[PDB]
Amino acid sequence: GPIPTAPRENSLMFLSTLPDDTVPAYGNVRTPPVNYLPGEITDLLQLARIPTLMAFERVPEPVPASDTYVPYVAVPTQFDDRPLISFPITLSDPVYQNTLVGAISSNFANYRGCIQITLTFCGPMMARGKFLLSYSPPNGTQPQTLSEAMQCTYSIWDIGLNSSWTFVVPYISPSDYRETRAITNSVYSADGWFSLHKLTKITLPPDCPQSPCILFFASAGEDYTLRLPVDCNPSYVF
Amino acid sequence: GPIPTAPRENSLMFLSTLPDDTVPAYGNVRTPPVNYLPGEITDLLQLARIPTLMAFERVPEPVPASDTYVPYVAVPTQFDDRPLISFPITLSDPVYQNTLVGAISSNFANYRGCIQITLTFCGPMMARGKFLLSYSPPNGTQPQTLSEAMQCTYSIWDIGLNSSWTFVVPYISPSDYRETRAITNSVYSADGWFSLHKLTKITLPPDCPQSPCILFFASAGEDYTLRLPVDCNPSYVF
Amino acid sequence: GPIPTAPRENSLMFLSTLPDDTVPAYGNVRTPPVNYLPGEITDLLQLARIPTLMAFERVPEPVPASDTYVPYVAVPTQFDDRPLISFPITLSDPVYQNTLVGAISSNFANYRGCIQITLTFCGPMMARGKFLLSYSPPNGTQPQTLSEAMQCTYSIWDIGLNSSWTFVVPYISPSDYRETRAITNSVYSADGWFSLHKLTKITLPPDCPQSPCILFFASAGEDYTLRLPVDCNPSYVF
Amino acid sequence: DRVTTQTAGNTAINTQSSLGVLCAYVEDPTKSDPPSSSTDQPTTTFTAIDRWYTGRLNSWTKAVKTFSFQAVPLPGAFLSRQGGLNGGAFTATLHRHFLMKCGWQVQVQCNLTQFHQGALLVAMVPETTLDVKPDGKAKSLQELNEEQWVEMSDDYRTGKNMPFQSLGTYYRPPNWTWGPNFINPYQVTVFPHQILNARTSTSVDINVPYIGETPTQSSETQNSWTLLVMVLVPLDYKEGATTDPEITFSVRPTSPYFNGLRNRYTAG
Amino acid sequence: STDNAETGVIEAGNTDTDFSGELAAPGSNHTNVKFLFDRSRLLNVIKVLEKDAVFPRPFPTQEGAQQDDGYFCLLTPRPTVASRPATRFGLYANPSGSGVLANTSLDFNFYSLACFTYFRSDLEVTVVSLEPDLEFAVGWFPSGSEYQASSFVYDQLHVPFHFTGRTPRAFASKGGKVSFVLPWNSVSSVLPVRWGGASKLSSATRGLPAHADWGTIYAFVPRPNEKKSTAVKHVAVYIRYKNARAWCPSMLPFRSYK
Amino acid sequence: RGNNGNMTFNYYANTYQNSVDFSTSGILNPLGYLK
Amino acid sequence: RGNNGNMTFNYYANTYQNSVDFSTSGILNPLGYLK
Amino acid sequence: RGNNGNMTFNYYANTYQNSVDFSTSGILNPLGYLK
Ligand SMILES: [Ca+2]
């Protein structure tokens, strides 16, 4: 006979994220095989690990072409005891906006793990020089001086045969996960700053272009993870 | 006691194609046996494989009987370097309209596999001659010349003791399935053309009728398959 | 937790013939035993097999008592080459109306198997005579002549020591089941006719009553079956 | 090979251009059992009815158009003697039984020449009413002779002209537009058939088993099989060649079962 | 390749028969008969009874007859007219005139793919309301049976006998639907898609089968005759073929070139 | 059995779903015998 | 099978859910044979 | 798996609940290889 049941208060509810299936309406359909297709992606982290270019406003001297954002930093010849460039370790910051790590990460609420900054020297091969890359966890005031940067996490990069240098921003946080978007500024959504200082000015022989450029890439480190899918920002269509 | 349940959002829905049964209202009924009945059909492909006649508009010279469509092609005596007849390999084309393959196929969205064209010479036995049947996959322009047809898939048929010739249109497609109906013309719903050229004019002895006719049949090849049942076109009743 | 369910389109429906139980409202009730009661009936066919009297309009010469229908046929003395009595093998015919076979059968849509007609001679024991009972499957015209009846299924019954004769109407049909009610006359609801002819006139000694009577009974044969319960005709109460 | 002689009773039909016998649905359409719907011992085959009966059809001429046809109802043709098809003892037995179940072996004969051209489609078609006029009456022998061949038309292609019951004055007469007994001329090759092509043979053979909506059927009204002869390619030849080739056919009832013996059928 | 179609048998070939290639692997089995017909489609739209009815009389029906038209639905893919079996299928191009417009039905989909002579299956019936918030019930009687007319009086209210009986009666909830499956119940073994016989020996219509159906359904309001309304209500009848089987290859309807 | 197609399960015990007699502790037979 | 994806359970017995013939006690075959 | 927490039962057969390719018969790998 009939099985007695007691439907719950949420009967007939439509839950967009319900972890279950619904009834098939047109089954017994066989599809063309996809074994011939290479390049299958299993997890978006596979793409977040691919380094992509960052973006910086071209030093107050833009090109007649509107929206003058560049993927590199030109190394000025004049000495100055402050960073050549610096940006916060806040994933929602515009410098990461168009990198895959940043774009993908903006679609989740949290991240855990290391971010990786990769630099590629694009000046002439005859050039020589050294740079000091540093990462400073939050402080009341952002460090500017070489003396200050040198007291944080840093590495000195030497220009030579090999063109690039990878710099892993350690995951130093009070919480096991951090906010992907700095809706409100806090120690959970803003984790300090990365900065690049020229250690010893670039040296060039005669008849060599000046101001060599350094390309910047960002990507997820090997232990980088994203959690909690969130609603997307549809503005890219406006 | 009562089992707690959570009816889903689509409760009470009536799905015309639901892959399941409904409650019996008048059961325990035994029916007269049907073992005595021969000719049982298990799959409609069994019928699509039976060749049936195609239809062509009788060369601009109809009979006083309206709707002058014929199942054959009369072989004219005058030389002309273009096809005696040709039609697209588009299952919704009128030439297949009343063949079983075409009629059955029009009730599904896709097909995969070979189509078979069968020709039967119905001229006198004293007649001799040769024909060139060809299939051309899509091209910007439909081939017309013997020289062009000869560069596609083709076979030369010799008239003699045996009256017929089967021609299998290979399944040459970018996709594993093709559209059964050319709602929009594309490489997925139109697959080129089949054409018949007279290779060497028909030769007859004196006192023999002229213009022998060739009957055309169409059917599903052995690897022919149909997928996705679609709504029928009820116009046959209007 | 709650089991997800998907109630169907026919939820809450009340089906008068649903092959299932409903909830008990006053259980744990023990009833007085019925072992003491003999005569239990398991199937109504057990009753349909019991022969009961048929009914005929008394030959255009009724008794002052309205509704003059009789369970017998008086054997007239005058010779006449046509049936003494005849009726169709159509279960809804009035001659079966009040027999158990007919009454029970009228409550189902179909029957399969043999019907049995039993005759009992009720004339004096000194009487002698012979009768020819015949069954004719459908024909354009109903047979009347002894010569015609004799070409169908028939048996010759001799009057003597034993008083009765059973006649089984064979089940001769195009379909495995036949209609119980001749709503529309067809080969599926009307199966010919049964008729009784006097073969050799009845012979009696002097001082013997004339016109002996023959009682008619109808019942289900051993292979008789009924299928599909239908709505009853409540008119017996009006 | 191409030369065969088929014997049945005191009958034998020969052909020297056989294409083989087309057997419908099963390898041996002759195997058949008694009907489960009749409890009386049936009358089965006896030598006087185990044979070929031969009759005539109207001649084929240059004027007959594509898709024009002739139909032979079975066992109807035996009952009306269409084409002179007198079924001897078979008809006599048929007329005396309410029910009859059987299959058929048929051969259509039509010789042409190596100088003629044209083709006839010969098929055994299940459940048709091609032998009836739209008014519901069966075509008489005279009507068949007057028309010779029935022309394919919108009515036949549509089933629009099949027999029907007039509704009565109570109803607005509707526009009849279609019928399930239509004929799609292009698909007649779906049925058990052979093609009689002037250039390949002078005969065709088809062998079909019993079929029906029920185990057995009314002798007087059944028409489960109909022999159909339809023009696919018009006849043609030069002056001097024999004109109007004739067409004949032979029919043999197979594994018959008769039930419900009674006096001869008499129309009501 | 060389052949002789006159034989009545032509083998299905493939690319490698005369050319060079291989067989294409099978993509589906959707042409399978059982799978193909196992889906619901619209059969007819009928009016809802609000009192005991008078079943339409047999043809030919003469003017002046008193009966209920457009209420009974014969369960069959075959053409029907005024709740009865038919041969020709008709409609009304000119709905203007005098006389009752006979209801007609046809399973359009079924016949577009019915390339066979006989068919058989069980039948799943679904009745959907075409009216807002309608409370109705469905009645059904077997092939070869008939509608039980008249009514009985309870508390001076007339209750049609179609409220009772031994056959299925399905009362839907307000705004609900009705659904159930019926077995092949005709006395015939199979249903003739096309037929060449006659159901009677005299004055019969050739080609008109007598019981090629799964019975008849009708809909009614669970209310006594007295509480009758004036606005006619309609209900849609859907059918689905279960465990379908087919026999003897045949043709598909002719498609006009005009 | 009766008009019941439920082969599977019986939620309520036999003594609740049905009534049963208290204790005092195919082949259709004829209803009449000639002796 | 037909258009049925229910592999699991059948609540109603086969003789109720379906009709069955009473007793009287892949590979697609051709519908025609040339002999 | 996907966003599915149903470990228990699957009422509809795999070929109905999902589509499957017809036959023609943790560890995240790189999408690029330097050779
Ligand atoms: Ca529930």
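^ calcium ion complex. The radius of gyration of chain C is 24 Å. Residues 35 and 236 of chain C are 34 Å apart (CA to CA).
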